[PDB]
Amino acid sequence: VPGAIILDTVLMLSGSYLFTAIVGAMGWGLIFYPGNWPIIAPLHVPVEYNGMLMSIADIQGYNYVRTGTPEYIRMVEKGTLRTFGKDVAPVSAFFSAFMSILIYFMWHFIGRWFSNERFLQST
Amino acid sequence: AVRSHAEAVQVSRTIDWMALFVVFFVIVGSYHIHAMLTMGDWDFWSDWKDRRLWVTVTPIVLVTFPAAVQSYLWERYRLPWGATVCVLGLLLGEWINRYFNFWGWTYFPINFVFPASLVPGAIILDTVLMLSGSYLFTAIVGAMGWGLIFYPGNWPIIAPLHVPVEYNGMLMSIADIQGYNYVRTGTPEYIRMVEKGTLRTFGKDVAPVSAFFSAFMSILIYFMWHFIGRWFSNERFLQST
Amino acid sequence: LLDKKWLTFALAIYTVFYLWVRWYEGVYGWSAGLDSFAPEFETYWMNFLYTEIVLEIVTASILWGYLWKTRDRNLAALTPREELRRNFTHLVWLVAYAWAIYWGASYFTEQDGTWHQTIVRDTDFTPSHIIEFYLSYPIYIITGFAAFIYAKTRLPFFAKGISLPYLVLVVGPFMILPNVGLNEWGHTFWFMEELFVAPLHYGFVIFGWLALAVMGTLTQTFYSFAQGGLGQSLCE
Amino acid sequence: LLDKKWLTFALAIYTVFYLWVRWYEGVYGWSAGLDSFAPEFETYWMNFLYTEIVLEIVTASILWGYLWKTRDRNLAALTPREELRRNFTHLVWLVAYAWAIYWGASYFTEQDGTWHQTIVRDTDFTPSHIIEFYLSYPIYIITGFAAFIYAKTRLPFFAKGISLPYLVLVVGPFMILPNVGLNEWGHTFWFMEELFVAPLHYGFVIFGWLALAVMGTLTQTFYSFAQGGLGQSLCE
Amino acid sequence: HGEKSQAAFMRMRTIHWYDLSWSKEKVKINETVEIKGKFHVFEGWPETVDEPDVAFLNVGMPGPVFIRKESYIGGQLVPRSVRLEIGKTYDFRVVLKARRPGDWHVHTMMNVQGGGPIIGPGKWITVEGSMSEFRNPVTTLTGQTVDLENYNEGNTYFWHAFWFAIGVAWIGYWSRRPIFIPRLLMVDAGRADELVSATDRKVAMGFLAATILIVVMAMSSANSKYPITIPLQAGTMRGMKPLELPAPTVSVKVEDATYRVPGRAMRMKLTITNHGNSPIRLGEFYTASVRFLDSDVYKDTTGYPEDLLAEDGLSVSDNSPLAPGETRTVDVTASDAAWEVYRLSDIIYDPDSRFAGLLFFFDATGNRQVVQIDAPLIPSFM
Amino acid sequence: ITVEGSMSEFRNPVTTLTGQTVDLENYNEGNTYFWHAFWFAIGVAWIGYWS
Amino acid sequence: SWSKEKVKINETVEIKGKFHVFEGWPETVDEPDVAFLNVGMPGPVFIRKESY
Ligand SMILES: CCCCCCCCCCCC(=O)OC[C@H](COP(=O)(O)OCC[N+](C)(C)C)OC(=O)CCCCCCCCCCC
Ligand SMILES: CCCCCCCCCCCC(=O)OC[C@H](COP(=O)(O)OCC[N+](C)(C)C)OC(=O)CCCCCCCCCCC
Ligand SMILES: CCCCCCCCCCCC(=O)OC[C@H](COP(=O)(O)OCC[N+](C)(C)C)OC(=O)CCCCCCCCCCC
Ligand SMILES: CCCCCCCCCCCC(=O)OC[C@H](COP(=O)(O)OCC[N+](C)(C)C)OC(=O)CCCCCCCCCCC
Ligand SMILES: CCCCCCCCCCCC(=O)OC[C@H](COP(=O)(O)OCC[N+](C)(C)C)OC(=O)CCCCCCCCCCC
Ligand SMILES: CCCCCCCCCCCC(=O)OC[C@H](COP(=O)(O)OCC[N+](C)(C)C)OC(=O)CCCCCCCCCCC
Ligand SMILES: CCCCCCCCCCCC(=O)OC[C@H](COP(=O)(O)OCC[N+](C)(C)C)OC(=O)CCCCCCCCCCC
Ligand SMILES: CCCCCCCCCCCC(=O)OC[C@H](COP(=O)(O)OCC[N+](C)(C)C)OC(=O)CCCCCCCCCCC
Ligand SMILES: CCCCCCCCCC(=O)OC[C@H](COP(=O)(O)OCC[N+](C)(C)C)OC(=O)CCCCCCCCC
Ligand SMILES: CCCCCCCCCC(=O)OC[C@H](COP(=O)(O)OCC[N+](C)(C)C)OC(=O)CCCCCCCCC
Ligand SMILES: CCCCCCCCCC(=O)OC[C@H](COP(=O)(O)OCC[N+](C)(C)C)OC(=O)CCCCCCCCC
Ligand SMILES: CCCCCCCCCC(=O)OC[C@H](COP(=O)(O)OCC[N+](C)(C)C)OC(=O)CCCCCCCCC
Ligand SMILES: CCCCCC(=O)OC[C@H](COP(=O)(O)OCC[N+](C)(C)C)OC(=O)CCCCC
Ligand SMILES: CCCCCC(=O)OC[C@H](COP(=O)(O)OCC[N+](C)(C)C)OC(=O)CCCCC
Ligand SMILES: CCCCCC(=O)OC[C@H](COP(=O)(O)OCC[N+](C)(C)C)OC(=O)CCCCC
Ligand SMILES: CCCCCC(=O)OC[C@H](COP(=O)(O)OCC[N+](C)(C)C)OC(=O)CCCCC
Ligand SMILES: CCCCCCCCCC
Ligand SMILES: CCCCCCCCCC
Ligand SMILES: [Cu+2]
Ligand SMILES: [Cu+2]
Ligand SMILES: [Cu+2]
Ligand SMILES: [Cu+2]
Ligand SMILES: [Cu+2]
């Protein structure tokens, strides 16, 4: 909802669709993780679980067995040798904001087409 | 308005010089970004200037801006030097960075970080367009020549770097020794996308095969970018953004 | 009068400032600028980043606001001679934009390649990056926006509507700056090798292509130049 | 009269039938529905599949044939009040289509994710699949086709031609049903992991996008509503 | 200078550098400095790093302040990428020749094809002299000696200037006449067919023919001169010879490992079993380029970098000699300012809180044993 | 394997390194519900204001 | 080794030997994880009855 509200208000004010695609989509991408942090922060409390360090969410995934969803399917941050300092969340947020600008620009015109009131005479 | 015929001519000449500056340096910036992020690694290093990947990739990704700028300049002014101005601007930007940053900031030798030569291909593209003004004929024949003449055009420069050397028990070319000696901390040897040999590499065909593949793909990319430049020339007034 | 010496200043300010920036990065590239966690890095490059971002925001706001506030309300009662003078001033703005585009997208971008090709990048804010994305890019963005606003607010040809080629030429190269997010994301995660031709770089290339809209922009400025004072001489 | 209580039935029939279906799958999900080669699976889910396919074919044929046979031949001599009533009936049809689209493409699709994310899928006809693709999809396809046919055969605005947005809104979501072939092919062969975001799923997404044609469809229905009885009041 | 930013657990479990030595600490221009040592590829190689199937022995340095004269893995030269095996120990030797004056932090590093740079310990090496005195001679198989600093530079400059001049001549030839606005007006208003007329076509034909002919002639001339050329030599080199280390006589089991947040110390409880026939004592703990030493047991004499060396940073609860056959459990604390300076405390930010390292055990006679330990590293906050 | 009893009797306690014991069955459930309801209410308020 | 040098139609010829996979396998060639024992010949002038 925070991203949606940003996108809607940035469109209504300054009715420019280009301005929306640039600024509002930026905000939509950037506010996602901070918007969800109050919910998931309690699940990131570290726990000493049977000799291994695990977050509460990690223990949830371990305990509540998903027969069809093994752990390796999890596409999550695993660390890289080019992960400099404490930058994982902000870098991902900014990449998501830029790609959100691009996708918003594409889907504005996609929706423009989907609004067509044409009468295709024959199928 | 303008006072007389003479003042109109002087104003037109001043506009000519200023607009030439604008065209040249906007092309320098955009074309250099595109080139250095589509062929820069091969263009950076003599030990990357190989017969397969360098010869293949460089003309293909470098014919982009000449096609668009030709489709604009020739069509609107009958100025047959879009390809030449693109290539000259790219070479100027590349050489400025090589001299003042590659050799200036860092201290890599110029004989190690020199750029590739592209003026012969640009001249072919421009002359083949001006003669036989057909853009299709240009895309087919001139782009063929642009792709084919790349490696022979650069051979006088890189040939001395291919003299074999017996280096500490292993055979190495002079460019290989340059890449070995002048340490690139961020650029390990395995990143080098160069000819490494295959079991389906028949005889002495690596350079000509790559050149012909680059010429065909250059035809295709020129055809695409002619229309891309046609769009970029639009004089429309998008009423609202 | 017509074309005045504002063009000399337009060239000289960028030339001098960027020569000083190059001197600064030559002096502090190594030796306070290699280790991103050293205290001297904070005083010589993080402070540079902060100051340059604040100054760019302030300068952009002031320049764009002044250009928009001093917009010509009575464009109809503009003489052809004054229109020619304003066209020359807009051409000076375009020259400044081209110079800034060169400095941003060729010099500091490729010099950047060298930087990365020589050192192990330690952060998203390498002393040199700070120079390219947080200066060689905001500066040319500010210049392009200022040129577009000047055209829209002083030239009747560029008024009564937003020119599509000018908008593309002004906004596409701007999109390179938010594209830095893709650069970072696809440097640390995706792609661990320092390859300048890696797909994590196609966002810079795609929006570098939009600078080709300068062709339509320049034919539009040619038509604006040749409105009332087109001649005669030309085609006569 | 105008809008009558057919809307209440349109909502209630889908709500009640799908609540009963959910109860059925809650009772027989485990325990005759986990093992696809057990005899009880044949009596509780294969029989369900057969019966539902036969009933869907029969219902589609009967409904579409009746709607086409009772088509209004003399659309010219239709009073504005009757046109308004028919527009409201078509809006009720669109409401039923939206409700069925919800039940098919959100509820039973995502509940499906859960099913697969929890069990080892044993066949192309999991008790739950039978529910989604062989019910949550044919039912909404039937409703969409019926709404399109009603518009074409009772509304003069939607007559004299096939509306492109309506055709897209009606046929694109239908294409999800044959797309199940890609789902199966790219579950057993391609992709062995149960990932809902795997490319074997982009066929469902692409044709889910075509439901956005409801926007053009709805502005068309607004224009059809505002033909003779547009007011006045509105714009007055 | 590029580490302290990589993930702590990834620096801990990729490659362990030990027995590092530097031939000289201060050199003149053209003087050679040799870096030797061993590196062990950790068995628990992180899945996010591609296996070292294609690896390159590189040098961490700020540009070519040194030139890499030679580099060896095992005993053989490795100018190309090499294949390394997980769990194997290799010895390396890099020969550097000083080129640029100054104080340089020289690292030995291993670049892995799909994992990025693995930077080893870095040492400050002073270079004195002038860059103008640097020479890089090499003798070719054609019997000529050239200096790699300036060889072919004149030819490159000449050819680039020649082709740039040709292009500039073309552009200027077309730029003598008015360029943009009159030509645009001529093209727009009616058919143009007047701005491109003979002898413009003749000049363009001359340009095209001259370009093709000059390219062909230059290629032929560059083939007559330098008649012997070879392509670039590339390709990953297999069959790197690993060290045949004796099986360790010490077995260590890590029973929990903790570090305080915040803090500069790491604590672990080890069960050490002494096999063989000599009393052993724990002398060193190396985790990621940081050597925690028990000064009462072992002292470093190889000139290890001071900021990476903890002379008394290793405290063992009971470091009395361990008789053969005897098993005891001790509390080992590795504490030094390096643990926070090199951000080894930032493993709390990592998505995999596991550490790896090397324990060096020394007996009375002085011969040493290397054992590898790896365990989860549990932060402690209260 | 036969399981007897009631699901309501199930407990999944865990002790964190911060010194608190929580039940994984319902830990953070109230906070999640509260935040989701709050943001949904904000969006509904926006839509109703315009509606 | 080759069992025969000259054969009649329908007659069998057997080719035996050993091959050693070189340790320094070139990186440009994928590792022989998937390999097929084939016969180099101009079309089915022989039919491969067996291969071991
Ligand atoms: C109002 C104007 C003035 C404010 C200007 C802000 C400048 C940057 C602040 C950095 C905060 C910090 O602390 O550094 C960065 C922090 C982590 O910090 P760290 O863990 O200490 O990193 C250790 C290394 N260091 C000490 C050198 C910092 O996260 C990040 O990596 C964020 C990376 C973002 C990359 C993509 C950005 C795209 C921008 C697009 C613009 C249109
Ligand atoms: C129009 C622009 C609106 C921007 C709104 C920003 C609200 C404040 C966010 C604080 C984030 C924080 O606290 O730091 C960064 C943290 C991640 O930290 P982490 O190191 O991964 O650790 C995680 C654990 N924590 C939370 C205990 C440390 O959150 C983020 O991923 C947000 C990244 C995007 C920041 C956008 C602001 C920068 C300028 C944007 C314009 C170019
Ligand atoms: C045209 C665009 C102009 C935007 C100017 C920037 C406004 C920043 C507002 C404050 C955000 C903040 O303070 O929070 C951002 C947090 C910092 O995270 P942290 O340092 O890791 O830890 C938390 C430390 N706190 C608790 C002290 C915050 O998230 C990030 O890492 C994102 C930082 C990258 C910002 C890139 C901006 C590039 C602008 C380029 C202009 C030419
Ligand atoms: C004016 C008209 C008459 C001239 C016609 C020329 C015919 C070919 C000459 C071959 C030269 C030679 O020598 O063979 C080929 C030489 C290498 O030679 P090798 O090492 O001896 O190869 C050993 C094997 N052999 C003895 C059988 C040759 O390079 C090449 O592999 C070139 C390969 C090019 C492939 C793509 C071509 C696309 C063409 C598109 C057309 C529109
Ligand atoms: C419009 C068409 C214009 C064509 C202009 C050609 C100029 C002459 C080039 C001689 C090349 C050479 O000498 O042989 C081939 C060599 C490569 O040889 P290599 O075996 O890799 O060894 C490298 C070391 N050398 C040089 C010591 C042997 O160079 C090339 O890669 C050029 C390949 C493209 C040739 C194009 C001509 C064929 C017909 C084209 C029309 C269909
Ligand atoms: C419609 C298109 C018609 C084009 C006709 C061909 C003109 C050739 C001009 C001479 C080039 C030359 O002699 O040089 C080409 C060199 C030969 O290289 P090499 O043999 O390896 O060694 C060097 C040996 N020299 C020093 C003796 C040259 O490069 C190549 O390998 C490219 C050869 C492939 C040419 C494919 C042409 C296919 C045409 C098909 C028409 C239906
Ligand atoms: C489009 C709008 C662009 C806005 C951004 C502009 C960025 C300006 C530079 C940021 C500096 C910073 O942040 O660093 C502050 C630096 C840090 O150096 P120091 O440690 O004090 O050493 C002593 C200073 N020396 C090393 C430079 C000798 O010191 C300063 O005060 C000096 C900054 C001078 C900048 C103005 C001169 C530019 C060249 C002349 C033609 C214009
Ligand atoms: C668009 C056109 C859609 C056409 C498809 C409709 C599918 C209908 C269900 C198929 C059942 C099947 O196939 O199974 C037959 C089932 C198998 O259960 P049983 O073993 O007999 O147990 C005893 C039955 N209980 C378990 C249900 C108690 O028994 C039956 O006879 C009962 C089927 C009742 C369906 C009608 C009620 C729906 C809710 C009320 C609002 C409409
Ligand atoms: C050169 C690029 C710099 C950024 C400017 C991009 C905005 C362009 C949008 C546009 O085309 O104009 C639409 C409206 C027109 O409304 P106006 O009737 O001009 O209102 C003027 C009074 N106002 C300052 C309160 C707005 O005007 C607006 O869009 C709002 C103008 C106020 C700027 C802040 C609005 C955005 C809030 C996030
Ligand atoms: C997944 C991609 C999204 C689908 C969107 C593609 C729509 C393409 C537009 C289209 O269908 O053109 C219809 C013409 C037939 O024309 P006519 O029937 O003569 O109609 C006259 C007016 N008109 C020419 C403008 C249509 O061409 C025809 O031959 C009729 C074919 C109509 C099929 C369109 C239905 C699409 C449903 C998926
Ligand atoms: C069927 C395909 C075979 C190849 C032919 C493709 C060329 C078609 C180009 C075209 O559409 O015509 C443009 C010009 C028209 O000029 P014209 O006024 O026709 O000049 C005729 C005298 N001329 C022979 C010297 C040219 O004419 C020309 O383009 C030049 C014609 C001379 C051919 C050689 C020119 C190309 C040099 C590389
Ligand atoms: C990376 C891809 C290259 C970007 C090129 C895409 C350009 C697409 C063309 C476009 O923007 O259409 C503008 C219309 C708004 O129309 P209006 O503002 O009514 O202008 C009337 C005349 N016109 C309809 C022909 C434009 O549609 C709109 O809603 C306004 C959006 C304008 C955004 C275009 C700016 C592109 C900058 C990146
Ligand atoms: C069209 C772009 C020109 C870029 C030239 C450049 O980067 O200059 C810096 C470089 C620096 O090398 P150097 O001149 O030896 O002076 C070194 C000073 N630092 C290290 C601060 C750059 O050389 C100059 O300053 C020459 C002046 C050219 C004026 C257009
Ligand atoms: C327009 C051409 C785009 C081609 C993309 C490409 O070259 O990707 C190479 C990469 C193969 O990875 P690789 O080159 O092996 O990377 C080695 C280094 N690591 C493992 C750290 C990424 O493939 C992907 O990961 C998918 C790319 C999607 C493009 C939209
Ligand atoms: C807008 C979609 C509503 C979906 C509600 C649903 O799936 O209901 C089934 C679920 C089943 O849980 P419960 O109520 O405990 O009854 C269990 C009966 N079975 C196991 C057959 C579902 O709860 C209800 O039946 C509540 C009635 C809501 C009416 C809109
Ligand atoms: C619009 C983005 C599409 C990207 C496709 C993709 O993510 O594919 C991943 C997959 C890589 O396979 P992977 O994720 O390793 O699958 C692991 C599970 N198995 C081995 C059973 C398939 O690549 C392919 O096989 C080609 C896909 C073609 C798309 C048109
Ligand atoms: C990728 C987005 C393309 C959207 C198509 C819109 C076409 C509009 C034509 C009227
Ligand atoms: C891939 C090349 C497509 C270029 C688009 C040109 C569109 C022109 C419409 C006027
Ligand atoms: Cu990059
Ligand atoms: Cu699926
Ligand atoms: Cu260092
Ligand atoms: Cu090890
Ligand atoms: Cu062998």
Residue type, position F11, single letter: R
Residue type, position C157, single letter: F
The Cα–Cα gap between E229 and C42 comes to 50
B44 CA → ligand 6 middle, Å: 30
The Cα–Cα gap between C182 and B37 comes to 14
Task: Choose among E326, E327, E330: nearest CA to E317.
Answer: E330
B34 is written with which tokens? 């595109």
**CB distance C224 to C159 below 8 Å:** no
Q: Which residues of E251-284 are buried (b: 16+ CB within 10 A; e: fewer)?
A: ebebeebbbeeeebbbbbbbebebeeebbbbbbb
Task: Choose among D136, D158, D157, D139: nearest CA to D149.
Answer: D158
Query: In 10 A of CB D187, how many CB atoms?
Result: 18
DSSP assignment letter at G29: S
E254 is written with which tokens? 């890590």
Class of domain B1-238: mainly alpha
Residue type, position B66, single letter: P
A55 is written with which tokens? 């977050």
CATH number at residue E192: 1.10.287.710
Q: Name the helix (H) or strand (E) containing C6.
A: helix C6-28
B139 CA → ligand 11 middle, Å: 14
Task: Choose among B80, B82, A70: nearest CA to E205.
Answer: B80
Q: Name the helix (H) or strand (E) containing B12.
A: helix B5-36
DSSP B162-215: G-EEEETTEEEEHHHHHHHHB--TT--GGG-------TT--SS-HHHHHHHHHH
| Strand extents, DSSP E, chain A | 46-49, 52-55
CA D51 to chain centre: 18
Q: Do F43 and A59 touch (CB under 8 A)?
A: no
Q: What are the Cα distances from residue C189, in Å, to A71, E115, E183? A: 20, 10, 52
The Cα–Cα gap between B150 and B159 comes to 14
The Cα–Cα gap between E33 and E27 comes to 7
Structural domains in chain D (count) = 1
Query: In 10 A of CB F10, how many CB atoms?
Result: 9
Task: Choose among B43, C121, C191, B44: nearest CA to E113.
Answer: C191
Q: What are the Cα distances from residue C45, in Å, to C24, C119, E31? A: 10, 16, 34
**How many Cα atoms are found within 13 Å in the side-chain-facing hemisphere of E191?**
1
DSSP assignment letter at C211: G
Q: What are the Cα distances from residue B14, in Å, to B19, B77, D161, D178? A: 9, 17, 60, 66
| Residues forming a β-bridge with E73 | E76, E92
Closest approach atom of ligand 7 to CA C20: 39
Listed by number, the residues of chain G in 1-52 with a beta carbon closer than 8 Å to a beta carbon of chain B are 26-29
Residue at which a domain ends, from E191, E216, E246: E246
Q: How many CB pairs under 8 A join C and E?
A: 50
**Same structural domain, E303 and E322:** yes
Tell me which method was used to determine the 3D structure. cryo-EM
**CB distance B194 to B48 below 8 Å:** yes
**Same structural domain, E169 and E237:** no
Cα dihedral E243/E249/E255/E256 (nearest 10): -30
The Cα–Cα gap between B53 and E95 comes to 31
What is the SS3 assignment for E104?
A: strand
**Residue E199: cis peptide before it, omega within 30 degrees of 0:** yes
Query: In 10 A of CB B188, how many CB atoms?
Result: 23
Q: Is C171 in the pocket of ligand 12 (CB under 6 A)?
A: yes
Query: In 10 A of CB E36, how many CB atoms?
Result: 17
C212 is written with which tokens? 């080709």
Q: Phi then psi for F23, rounded to 5 degrees?
A: -100, 120
> Which residue's alpha carbon is at the smallest distance from atom 22 of ligand 8?
D44
In a domain, residue C232? The reply is no
Biggest alpha carbon distance in chain C? 69
| Helix, strand, coil % over all residues of chain F, rounded to 5 | 50, 10, 40
| Residues forming a β-bridge with E123 | E106
The Cα–Cα gap between E200 and E203 comes to 5
**Same structural domain, E352 and E218:** no
Residues recorded for chain D: 236
In chain E, whose CA is at the least distance from the CA of C118?
E63
Q: Which residues of E186-203 are buried (b: 16+ CB within 10 A; e: fewer)?
A: bbeeeebeebbeeebeee
**CB distance C97 to B88 below 8 Å:** no
Residue at which a domain ends, from E177, E207, E232: E232
The Cα–Cα gap between C198 and B190 comes to 14
Cα dihedral D9/D15/D20/D23 (nearest 10): -160
Give burial (CB, 10 Å; 0-12/13-18/19+) of G6. exposed
Strand order in the sheet with E309-310: E309-310, E291-293, E280-286, E354-363, E368-376
Q: Is C199 in the pocket of ligand 14 (CB under 6 A)?
A: yes
| Residues forming a β-bridge with E38 | E18, E91
Give burial (CB, 10 Å; 0-12/13-18/19+) of D61. exposed
Ligand 8, residues at Cβ distance < 6 Å: D 13, 16-17, 20, 24, 44, 47-48, 51-52, 55-56, 59, 138-139, 142
Q: Phi/psi class of residue A14: alpha, beta or left (left: φ > 0; alpha: ψ in -120 to 50)?
A: left
Angle between helix axes C138-154 and C80-102 (nearest 10 degrees) is 170
CATH number at residue E52: 2.60.120.570
**Residue E369: cis peptide before it, omega within 30 degrees of 0:** no
Structural domains in chain E (count) = 3
In a domain, residue D89? The reply is yes
Residues recorded for chain G: 52
Q: What is the separation, in whole angstroms, between the first and last Cα of chain G?
A: 14
In a domain, residue C231? The reply is no
**CB distance D49 to D132 below 8 Å:** no
The Cα–Cα gap between E379 and A38 comes to 23
The Cα–Cα gap between C167 and B240 comes to 10
What is the SS3 assignment for D210?
A: helix
Q: What is the separation, in whole angstroms, between the first and last Cα of chain A?
A: 40
Task: Choose among C179, C164, C176, C175: nearest CA to C214.
Answer: C164
Residue type, position A51, single letter: G
DSSP C100-121: HHHIIIIIHHHHHHHHHHHS--
**How many Cα atoms are found within 13 Å in the side-chain-facing hemisphere of D52?**
21
Cα dihedral F32/F33/F39/F43 (nearest 10): 150
**Residue E262: cis peptide before it, omega within 30 degrees of 0:** yes
Task: Check whether E105 is labelled as a binding-site residue.
Answer: yes
E210 CA → ligand 11 middle, Å: 20
DSSP assignment letter at F17: T
B132 CA → ligand 11 middle, Å: 4
> Which residue's alpha carbon is at the smallest distance from atom 23 of ligand 9?
A14
**CB distance B3 to E173 below 8 Å:** no
Q: What are the Cα distances from residue A104, in Å, to A3, C175, E259? A: 13, 14, 46
Q: Name the helix (H) or strand (E) containing A9.
A: helix A2-12
CA E71 to chain centre: 12
CA G26 to chain centre: 21
Residue at which a domain ends, from E246, E270, E285: E246
Location of structure tokens 């909802």: A1
Which chain B residues are closer than 8 Å to C213 by Cβ? 232
CATH number at residue C171: 1.20.1050.50
Cα dihedral G39/G44/G50/G52 (nearest 10): 10
Q: What are the Cα distances from residue B17, in Å, to B220, C9, C169, E196? A: 34, 17, 20, 21
Task: Check whether C187 is labelled as a binding-site residue.
Answer: yes
The Cα–Cα gap between E53 and G27 comes to 9
In chain E, whose CA is at the least distance from the CA of F20?
E382
The Cα–Cα gap between C106 and C5 comes to 26
Residues recorded for chain E: 382
- Tell me the residue range of the domain where D151 lies: 5-226
**CB distance B44 to B50 below 8 Å:** no
- Tell me the residue range of the domain where E9 lies: 1-135+233-246
Q: What is the separation, in whole angstroms, between the first and last Cα of chain E?
A: 33
Q: What are the Cα distances from residue C162, in Å, to B23, C22, C165, C175, D160? A: 21, 37, 9, 18, 39
CATH number at residue E366: 2.60.40.1580
Sign of CA dihedral D214, D217, D222, D225: negative
Closest approach atom of ligand 12 to CA C206: 1
What is the SS3 assignment for F30?
A: helix
In a domain, residue D168? The reply is yes
**CB distance E92 to E109 below 8 Å:** no
Asked if B8 is an interface residue toward chain C (Cβ–Cβ < 8 A), one would say yes
**Same structural domain, E253 and E354:** yes
Ligand closest to Cα of D112 equals: 20
Q: Do E148 and B51 touch (CB under 8 A)?
A: no
Residue type, position B146, single letter: W
**CB distance E357 to E285 below 8 Å:** yes
Residue type, position B179, single letter: G
DSSP D144-173: HHHHHHHHHHH-TTTSSS--HHHHHHHHHH
Give the contacts of G48 (CB within 8 A, at least 6 positions apart). G39
Interface test with G, best of E76, E80, E113, E236 (most G CBs within 10 A): E236
F17 CA → ligand 23 middle, Å: 57
Q: Which residues of E318-354 are buried (b: 16+ CB within 10 A; e: fewer)?
A: ebeebeeeeeeebebbbbbebbeebbbbbbebbebbb
**Same structural domain, E75 and E160:** no
Strand order in the sheet with E250-260: E314-316, E327-335, E265-274, E250-260, E378-380
Nearest residue, CB atoms, C185 vs list A22, A81, A95: A95
Asked if C235 is an interface residue toward chain E (Cβ–Cβ < 8 A), one would say yes
Resolution as reported, in Å: 2.2
Cα dihedral E15/E19/E20/E25 (nearest 10): 170
Residue type, position B187, single letter: T
Query: In 10 A of CB B26, how many CB atoms?
Result: 28
Q: What are the Cα distances from residue D186, in Å, to D134, D180, D195? A: 19, 10, 11
Nearest residue, CB atoms, B15 vs list C80, C105, C225: C225
Q: Do E6 and A48 touch (CB under 8 A)?
A: no
**CB distance E315 to E330 below 8 Å:** no
Three state DSSP letters for E136-193? CEEECCCCCEEECCCCCHHHHHHHHHHHHHHHHHHHHHHHCCCCCHHHHHHHHCCCCC
Q: Which residues of C17-36 are buried (b: 16+ CB within 10 A; e: fewer)?
A: ebeebbebbeebbbebbbbb
